Response regulator receiver domain protein (CheY-like)
Amino acid sequence: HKGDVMIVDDDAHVRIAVKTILSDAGFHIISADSGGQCIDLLKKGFSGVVLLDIMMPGMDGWDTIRAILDNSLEQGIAIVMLTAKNAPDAKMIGLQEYVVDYITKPFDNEDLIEKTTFFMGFVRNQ
Ligand SMILES: [Mg+2]
């Protein structure tokens, strides 16, 4: 397989769609409905691309990155933020250091595949 991907998004229809598109493209995908669940999943052991929704209720994408760092879970992942024109700022300066790219919603299937594949190469090399 082409590598492990985690889709973290509060929207079930996004998670399902991302799983479908990326499984057809050759990846293994796991899913999380919240920042809390993302942390839970990284604790089980995960290496690969994390597609992280910025706007989630309660704990947003930035809160999630802070939690990833607090738990020392950032090694062996590449975080791609799923954003929108409306996106909230990180309140802690420099969390952006841990984001390798952004993809703006709505996005097309080929953009998803292109970015996931590219940043998987980054994970596999480093
Ligand atoms: Mg959302």
Observations:
- The chain is about 40% helix and 25% strand.
